[PDB]
C-alpha cells in the first residue's frame, strides 16, 4: 500500500482584509465669521510641550526593546533555520543510509 | 504496510479569533473656550505625545510578541532537539 | 550496552553542563538531563 | 530496538529538563523499555 501526503497537506486559505479609512468630516459650517459677540481675546506666548519629543523617546525606548529582541529572534531564527538545515542534511542522511 | 508508516494528518485544525480589538474613537469638544475664544494659550499643546504613545504601543507590540518569539523558537529548538534525536534515532533504527 | 553506557555518561555530563550553561540561559531558559540507555 | 526504545525514553528524560531549558520541548520521561 503506497503512502500519499495528500491528507498531510491542508488548504492554507488567504483571508484578505479590505480596510477603507473613514473620511475627514468636521464642522466646515463653523467660522462663517469668527464671532465678535465675544471676540478672540488671544493669550499668546509659547515654548510648550514638546512632551511629544519625550514620547517619541518612549517610542524609541520600546524600540530599543524591539531592536534587542529582533536581535534575539534572529538567533532563534538561526536555530529554526539550523533545524531546517539539520532536516535538509538528515532527510538526505536517512535516504543515504536506507540506500547505501 | 507502506502507507500508515507516514501518519499523514492535518494537525492544522486550530482557529484563533482576532475579536476584541475595539478602537475607542476620542471625541474631544474641538472648540476653544465658549464662542470663538476668550482664551487661547491654555488648550493643552500635547496630543502628538498621545500619538507618539500610539507608536510606543506599536513598538511595544513589536517587542512583546518577539519577547514571545525568541520564546516560541527557544521552545521550537527544544522540540527540534526532539526531532534531532528522532532523526539520529531513525538512522540508528534503520542501521 | 556500553555504547549505551557512553550515551548514559554523556547524559550525566550534559546535565552537569546544562544546569550551568543552559542553566544561566535559565534567567531566559533552565536545566535537566537524566540517565540510562542500557540494553 | 529496545536500546532505541529506552534511548528515546531517556532523551524524554532529557526533554523535561530541555522543556525547562528554554520553556520549550515538552515530550518527557516516556518510552520506557525493560
Amino acid at each position: 500500500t503506497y503512502s500519499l501526503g495528500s491528507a498531510l497537506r491542508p488548504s492554507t486559505s488567504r483571508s484578505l482584509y479590505a480596510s477603507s479609512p473613514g473620511g475627514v468630516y468636521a464642522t466646515r459650517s463653523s467660522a462663517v465669521r469668527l464671532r465678535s459677540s465675544v471676540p478672540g481675546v488671544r493669550l499668546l506666548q509659547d515654548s510648550v510641550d514638546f512632551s511629544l519629543a519625550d514620547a517619541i523617546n518612549t517610542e524609541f525606548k520600546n524600540t530599543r526593546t524591539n531592536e534587542k529582541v529582533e536581535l534575539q529572534e534572529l538567533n532563534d531564527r538561526f536555530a529554526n533555520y539550523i533545524d531546517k538545515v539539520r532536516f535538509l542534511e538528515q532527510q538526505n542522511k536517512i535516504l543515504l543510509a536506507e540506500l547505501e | 504496510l507502506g502507507s500508515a508508516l507516514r501518519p499523514s494528518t492535518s494537525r492544522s485544525l486550530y482557529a484563533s479569533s482576532p475579536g476584541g480589538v475595539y478602537a475607542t474613537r476620542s471625541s474631544a469638544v474641538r472648540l476653544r473656550s465658549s464662542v470663538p475664544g476668550v482664551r487661547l494659550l491654555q488648550d493643552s499643546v500635547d496630543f502628538s505625545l498621545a500619538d507618539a504613545i500610539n507608536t510606543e504601543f506599536k513598538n511595544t507590540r513589536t517587542n512583546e510578541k518577539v519577547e514571545l518569539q525568541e520564546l516560541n523558537d527557544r521552545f521550537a529548538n527544544y522540540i527540534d532537539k526532539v526531532r534531532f534525536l528522532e532523526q539520529q534515532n531513525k538512522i540508528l533504527l534503520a542501521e | 550496552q556500553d555504547l549505551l553506557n557512553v550515551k548514559m555518561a554523556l547524559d550525566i555530563e550534559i546535565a552537569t553542563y546544562r544546569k550551568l550553561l543552559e542553566g544561566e540561559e535559565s534567567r531566559i531558559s533552565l536545566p535537566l538531563p537524566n540517565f540510562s540507555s542500557l540494553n | 530496538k529496545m536500546a532505541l526504545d529506552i534511548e528515546i525514553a531517556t532523551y524524554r528524560k532529557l526533554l523535561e529538563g530541555e522543556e525547562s531549558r528554554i520553556s520549550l520541548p515538552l515530550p518527557n520521561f516516556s518510552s520506557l523499555n525493560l
Partner: peptide, 15 residues
C-alpha cells in the same frame, strides 16, 4: 556503533 549513536543524546541548544 549503534550504541554510540544511542549515547549521542547528550549536548545543549545551539546558538
Amino acid at each position: 556503533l549503534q550504541a554510540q549513536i544511542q549515547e549521542q543524546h547528550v549536548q545543549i541548544d545551539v546558538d
